[PDB]
Design an enzyme around this catalytic site. Structure first.
Site, PDB file in Angstrom:
ATOM      1  N   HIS A 314      26.556  57.110  38.414  1.00 56.50           N
ATOM      2  CA  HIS A 314      26.593  55.667  38.654  1.00 56.50           C
ATOM      3  C   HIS A 314      25.578  54.956  37.765  1.00 56.50           C
ATOM      4  O   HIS A 314      24.378  55.221  37.837  1.00 56.50           O
ATOM      5  CB  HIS A 314      26.307  55.339  40.119  1.00 56.50           C
ATOM      6  CG  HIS A 314      26.667  53.936  40.490  1.00 56.50           C
ATOM      7  ND1 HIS A 314      27.911  53.591  40.977  1.00 56.50           N
ATOM      8  CD2 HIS A 314      25.964  52.784  40.402  1.00 56.50           C
ATOM      9  CE1 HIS A 314      27.955  52.285  41.174  1.00 56.50           C
ATOM     10  NE2 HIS A 314      26.786  51.772  40.832  1.00 56.50           N
ATOM     11  N   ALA A 315      26.077  54.043  36.939  1.00 58.98           N
ATOM     12  CA  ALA A 315      25.258  53.300  35.983  1.00 58.98           C
ATOM     13  C   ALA A 315      24.068  52.554  36.564  1.00 58.98           C
ATOM     14  O   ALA A 315      24.174  51.908  37.602  1.00 58.98           O
ATOM     15  CB  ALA A 315      26.141  52.321  35.213  1.00 58.98           C
ATOM     16  N   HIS A 344      26.414  44.499  31.544  1.00 61.75           N
ATOM     17  CA  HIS A 344      25.774  44.271  32.837  1.00 61.75           C
ATOM     18  C   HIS A 344      24.411  44.960  32.854  1.00 61.75           C
ATOM     19  O   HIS A 344      23.393  44.349  33.187  1.00 61.75           O
ATOM     20  CB  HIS A 344      26.640  44.857  33.957  1.00 61.75           C
ATOM     21  CG  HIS A 344      26.023  44.739  35.317  1.00 61.75           C
ATOM     22  ND1 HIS A 344      26.168  43.617  36.105  1.00 61.75           N
ATOM     23  CD2 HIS A 344      25.223  45.584  36.009  1.00 61.75           C
ATOM     24  CE1 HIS A 344      25.483  43.777  37.224  1.00 61.75           C
ATOM     25  NE2 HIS A 344      24.900  44.962  37.190  1.00 61.75           N
ATOM     26  N   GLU A 345      24.403  46.239  32.496  1.00 61.08           N
ATOM     27  CA  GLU A 345      23.173  47.024  32.488  1.00 61.08           C
ATOM     28  C   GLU A 345      22.184  46.544  31.433  1.00 61.08           C
ATOM     29  O   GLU A 345      20.978  46.531  31.671  1.00 61.08           O
ATOM     30  CB  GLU A 345      23.494  48.506  32.267  1.00 61.08           C
ATOM     31  CG  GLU A 345      24.390  49.137  33.341  1.00 61.08           C
ATOM     32  CD  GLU A 345      23.795  49.059  34.745  1.00 61.08           C
ATOM     33  OE1 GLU A 345      22.554  48.984  34.869  1.00 61.08           O
ATOM     34  OE2 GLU A 345      24.571  49.085  35.725  1.00 61.08           O
ATOM     35  N   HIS A 348      20.051  43.830  32.676  1.00 60.27           N
ATOM     36  CA  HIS A 348      18.894  44.225  33.474  1.00 60.27           C
ATOM     37  C   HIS A 348      17.749  44.554  32.523  1.00 60.27           C
ATOM     38  O   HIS A 348      16.609  44.141  32.738  1.00 60.27           O
ATOM     39  CB  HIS A 348      19.203  45.463  34.324  1.00 60.27           C
ATOM     40  CG  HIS A 348      20.063  45.186  35.518  1.00 60.27           C
ATOM     41  ND1 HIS A 348      19.760  44.208  36.441  1.00 60.27           N
ATOM     42  CD2 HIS A 348      21.182  45.798  35.972  1.00 60.27           C
ATOM     43  CE1 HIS A 348      20.654  44.232  37.414  1.00 60.27           C
ATOM     44  NE2 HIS A 348      21.527  45.187  37.154  1.00 60.27           N
ATOM     45  N   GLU A 372      21.267  40.534  38.560  1.00 60.52           N
ATOM     46  CA  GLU A 372      22.632  41.027  38.395  1.00 60.52           C
ATOM     47  C   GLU A 372      23.517  40.150  37.506  1.00 60.52           C
ATOM     48  O   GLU A 372      24.471  40.636  36.897  1.00 60.52           O
ATOM     49  CB  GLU A 372      23.313  41.145  39.760  1.00 60.52           C
ATOM     50  CG  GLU A 372      22.662  42.115  40.721  1.00 60.52           C
ATOM     51  CD  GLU A 372      22.530  43.505  40.131  1.00 60.52           C
ATOM     52  OE1 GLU A 372      23.399  43.892  39.321  1.00 60.52           O
ATOM     53  OE2 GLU A 372      21.564  44.207  40.492  1.00 60.52           O
ATOM     54  N   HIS A 470      26.463  52.372  46.845  1.00 56.82           N
ATOM     55  CA  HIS A 470      25.346  51.618  47.398  1.00 56.82           C
ATOM     56  C   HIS A 470      24.965  51.926  48.842  1.00 56.82           C
ATOM     57  O   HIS A 470      23.830  51.671  49.244  1.00 56.82           O
ATOM     58  CB  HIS A 470      25.609  50.117  47.220  1.00 56.82           C
ATOM     59  CG  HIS A 470      25.899  49.729  45.803  1.00 56.82           C
ATOM     60  ND1 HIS A 470      27.036  50.135  45.138  1.00 56.82           N
ATOM     61  CD2 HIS A 470      25.184  48.999  44.912  1.00 56.82           C
ATOM     62  CE1 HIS A 470      27.012  49.674  43.900  1.00 56.82           C
ATOM     63  NE2 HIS A 470      25.899  48.979  43.738  1.00 56.82           N
ATOM     64  N   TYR A 480      25.363  41.081  44.584  1.00 58.73           N
ATOM     65  CA  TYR A 480      26.558  40.992  43.746  1.00 58.73           C
ATOM     66  C   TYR A 480      27.412  39.781  44.087  1.00 58.73           C
ATOM     67  O   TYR A 480      28.071  39.214  43.214  1.00 58.73           O
ATOM     68  CB  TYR A 480      27.381  42.276  43.852  1.00 58.73           C
ATOM     69  CG  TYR A 480      26.585  43.497  43.444  1.00 58.73           C
ATOM     70  CD1 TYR A 480      26.241  44.473  44.379  1.00 58.73           C
ATOM     71  CD2 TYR A 480      26.147  43.658  42.130  1.00 58.73           C
ATOM     72  CE1 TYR A 480      25.478  45.585  44.016  1.00 58.73           C
ATOM     73  CE2 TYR A 480      25.383  44.760  41.755  1.00 58.73           C
ATOM     74  CZ  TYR A 480      25.053  45.720  42.704  1.00 58.73           C
ATOM     75  OH  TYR A 480      24.293  46.807  42.342  1.00 58.73           O
TER      76      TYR A 480
HETATM   77  C1  LIG Z   1      27.452  49.560  37.727  1.00 59.99           C
HETATM   78  C2  LIG Z   1      26.470  48.757  38.599  1.00 59.99           C
HETATM   79  N1  LIG Z   1      25.245  49.542  39.024  1.00 59.99           N
HETATM   80  C3  LIG Z   1      24.292  49.174  39.728  1.00 59.99           C
HETATM   81  C4  LIG Z   1      23.084  49.952  40.125  1.00 59.99           C
HETATM   82  C5  LIG Z   1      22.285  49.843  41.412  1.00 59.99           C
HETATM   83  C6  LIG Z   1      21.099  50.727  41.627  1.00 59.99           C
HETATM   84  C7  LIG Z   1      19.853  50.137  42.150  1.00 59.99           C
HETATM   85  C8  LIG Z   1      18.682  50.988  42.379  1.00 59.99           C
HETATM   86  C9  LIG Z   1      18.752  52.431  42.086  1.00 59.99           C
HETATM   87  C10 LIG Z   1      19.997  53.017  41.562  1.00 59.99           C
HETATM   88  C11 LIG Z   1      21.161  52.174  41.335  1.00 59.99           C
HETATM   89  C12 LIG Z   1      23.586  47.989  39.056  1.00 59.99           C
HETATM   90  O1  LIG Z   1      23.428  46.942  39.667  1.00 59.99           O
HETATM   91  O2  LIG Z   1      23.204  48.096  37.849  1.00 59.99           O
HETATM   92  C13 LIG Z   1      27.197  48.336  39.935  1.00 59.99           C
HETATM   93  O3  LIG Z   1      27.132  49.123  40.947  1.00 59.99           O
HETATM   94  N2  LIG Z   1      27.888  47.152  40.037  1.00 59.99           N
HETATM   95  C14 LIG Z   1      28.071  46.081  39.013  1.00 59.99           C
HETATM   96  C15 LIG Z   1      28.880  45.079  39.710  1.00 59.99           C
HETATM   97  C16 LIG Z   1      29.208  45.421  40.998  1.00 59.99           C
HETATM   98  C17 LIG Z   1      28.593  46.801  41.342  1.00 59.99           C
HETATM   99  C18 LIG Z   1      29.696  47.899  41.674  1.00 59.99           C
HETATM  100  O4  LIG Z   1      30.283  48.490  40.808  1.00 59.99           O
HETATM  101  O5  LIG Z   1      29.857  48.075  42.935  1.00 59.99           O
HETATM  102 ZN   LIG Z   2      23.197  45.477  38.303  1.00 55.26          ZN
END
Ligand SMILES: C[C@H](N[C@@H](CCc1ccccc1)C(=O)O)C(=O)N1CCC[C@H]1C(=O)O
Ligand SMILES: [Zn+2]
Ligand SMILES: [Cl-]
Ligand SMILES: [Cl-]
EC number: 3.4.15.1
Length: 574
Positions: A314-315, A344-345, A348, A372, A470, A480
């Site tokens: 997970h990104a 998106h990343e 951050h 975000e 999550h 989000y």
């Molecule tokens: C791909 C992205 N990753 C998360 C990661 C969250 C996270 C927080 C703290 C520790 C590990 C991961 C991020 O916001 O970058 C993500 O989960 N996103 C982007 C938009 C909606 C949400 C989804 O895919 O559910």
């Molecule tokens: Zn994010």
């Protein structure tokens, strides 16, 4: 005592940088190489950072914030008084940390196997099946299988997790963990504000839902789709039906206006994960924003390893708290969906670099939603037909509606899902939903907000929320929902600053220095001021508003109403 205060903050800052940097190291090693060893080390580091938090947090509580004059010091100290998990007795703390680690590992290594021996992992196997298969039974196998292996396996840990995170919240002055999470927005009216925003997007979502439902009825048959009911949750092209972009082919408004195979175009001309991030990096620099450091390209994990080690795919974006080391960990696949995720990343990462000189306690977004939204804003411009054509990934009012539809399948479909997740968790945290009702209430909300139904009846032991990253990862989700609303507000403002005229959806802020300056000024504030100020700096006003998103999709709303009306659709479900 004001003197002791500034001195305290200074010592907290320099010491926190060291400890947090060491923790990020152990956390990264675990995330990029899940093993018994890296797990044990991470758990050890948890105890060390907790000791630091308890040491400074205990001291911070000795200060009467009310008597503090300097507002910046006052703000930092109030924040340091919140020990978070470190508030838990040592025994509960180690149990809590192990539970979190176990849930994360369980989720990240889960696989769904066939009778033979072929086992599929979520990324990219199951994700690909959900996105490309048009066979009801195959989609069902993947949908149900993931929940059987990931969701069900998380259930044994969740009740205890809830008990412990709530205990920590109470020990920090909150009524429960949900209260603690919501406090990050410093907005007493938050719940009412978000509910109003959700309601404003109902006309759009309901019309999109009815249109897509009709299309699925056309493809899968009347015996599987009720034109006056919810849509089976496994037919939207995504494991969680949170974005419906992958079924664009089944719902294209004007099939006479064919669109290039974007994902095939990328592959056709040798696009790689590195190229994807390089393009994102270029978009940021074109706005006058900061480029990622050389160190970024050398330490990031932009591809799923092939050396045997297991990882958290997970990104995510990482700040190592030394103002120099920033990294992204993503099992990137070459396609448009992941290109957007790359942006998106990278958003951050840009935020990290922008506020790197602020006290560590203030190195956060104006509010989580702001963090975000950054990358998503640029991705909005990248997704435009003209920009994709400039990347050689693409070659009329109808092409326009097709585009808005593609955008809606992602942005509009996601609104109710992003709203739903924490509506569920807040009620689990406040005790309204017990472990006996976890799953039933999850589906009650999936129906109420998204208008979806489970394709296979759920049974005792199922814990579908656990099948969503999550949840076991304990990452808040309301951010989000906020992000999707405000990113359009930012897009609208930045486009106006860039001199764009005409339909908002046709805007591309590429290379706009005016837009870049507005984003930079806001990101530089970090968490130093209430979020309305950062909102004001970007948009010229201080509130959250759905008007921008509604304006962006106005042409599609009109088209959808006309289309649904002529087919006699009954919006909604029982
Ligand atoms: C791909 C992205 N990753 C998360 C990661 C969250 C996270 C927080 C703290 C520790 C590990 C991961 C991020 O916001 O970058 C993500 O989960 N996103 C982007 C938009 C909606 C949400 C989804 O895919 O559910
Ligand atoms: Zn994010
Ligand atoms: Cl689900
Ligand atoms: Cl949040």
């Amino acid at each position: 005592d004001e003197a002791e205060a500034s001195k305290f903050v200074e010592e907290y800052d320099r010491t926190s940088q060291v400890v947090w940097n060491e923790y990020a190291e152990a956390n990264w090693n675990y995330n990029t190489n899940i093993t018994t060893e890296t797990s044990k080390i991470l758990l050890q580091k948890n105890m060390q950072i907790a000791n630091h938090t308890l040491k400074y947090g205990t001291q911070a509580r000795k200060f009467d914030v009310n008597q503090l004059q300097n507002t910046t010091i006052k703000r930092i100290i109030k924040k340091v008084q919140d020990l978070e998990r470190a508030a838990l007795p040592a025994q509960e703390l180690e149990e809590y940390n192990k539970i979190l680690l176990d849930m994360e590992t369980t989720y990240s290594v889960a696989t769904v196997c066939h009778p033979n021996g072929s086992c599929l992992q979520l990324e990219p196997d199951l994700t690909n099946v959900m996105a490309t298969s048009r066979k009801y039974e195959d989609l069902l196998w993947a949908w149900e299988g993931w929940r059987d292996k990931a969701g069900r396996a998380i259930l044994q840990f969740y009740p205890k997790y809830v008990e412990l995170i709530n205990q920590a919240a109470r020990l920090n002055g909150y009524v429960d963990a949900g209260d603690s999470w919501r406090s990050m927005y410093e907005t007493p009216s938050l719940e009412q504000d978000l509910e109003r925003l959700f309601q404003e997007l109902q006309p759009l979502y309901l019309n999109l839902h009815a249109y897509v439902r009709r299309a699925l009825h056309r493809h899968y048959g009347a015996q599987h789709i009720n034109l006056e009911g919810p849509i089976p949750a496994h037919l939207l092209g995504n494991m969680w039906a949170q974005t419906w972009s992958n079924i664009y082919d089944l719902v294209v408004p004007f099939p006479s206006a064919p669109s290039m195979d974007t994902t095939e175009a990328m592959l056709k001309q040798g696009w790689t994960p590195r190229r994807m991030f390089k393009e994102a990096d270029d978009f940021f620099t074109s706005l006058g924003l900061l480029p990622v450091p050389p160190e970024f390209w050398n330490k990031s994990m932009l591809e799923k390893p092939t050396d045997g080690r297991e990882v958290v795919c997970h990104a995510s974006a990482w700040d190592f708290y030394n103002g120099k080391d920033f990294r992204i960990k993503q099992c990137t696949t070459v396609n448009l969906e992941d290109l957007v995720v790359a942006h998106h990343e990278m958003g951050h990462i840009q935020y990290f670099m922008q506020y790197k000189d602020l006290p560590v306690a203030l190195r956060e977004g104006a509010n989580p939603g702001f963090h975000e939204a950054i990358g998503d804003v640029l991705a909005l411009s990248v997704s435009t037909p003209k920009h994709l054509h400039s990347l050689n990934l693409l070659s009329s009012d109808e092409h326009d509606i097709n585009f808005l539809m593609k955008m809606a399948l992602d942005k509009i479909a996601f609104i109710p899902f992003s709203y739903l997740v924490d509506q569920w968790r807040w009620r689990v945290f406040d005790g309204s939903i017990t472990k006996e009702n976890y799953n039933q209430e999850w589906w009650s909300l999936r129906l109420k907000y998204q208008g979806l139904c489970p394709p296979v009846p759920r049974t005792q032991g199922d814990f579908d929320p656990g099948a969503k990253f999550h949840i076991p990862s304990s990452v808040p989700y309301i951010r989000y929902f906020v992000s999707f609303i405000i990113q359009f507000q930012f897009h609208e403002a930045l486009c106006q600053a860039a001199g764009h005229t005409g339909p908002l959806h046709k805007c591309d802020i590429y290379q706009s220095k005016e837009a870049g300056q507005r984003l930079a000024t806001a990101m530089k504030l970090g968490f130093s001021r209430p979020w309305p100020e950062a909102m004001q700096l970007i948009t010229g006003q201080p509130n959250m508003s759905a008007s921008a998103m509604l304006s962006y999709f106005k042409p599609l709303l009109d088209w959808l109403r006309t289309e649904n009306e002529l087919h006699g659709e009954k919006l909604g479900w029982p």
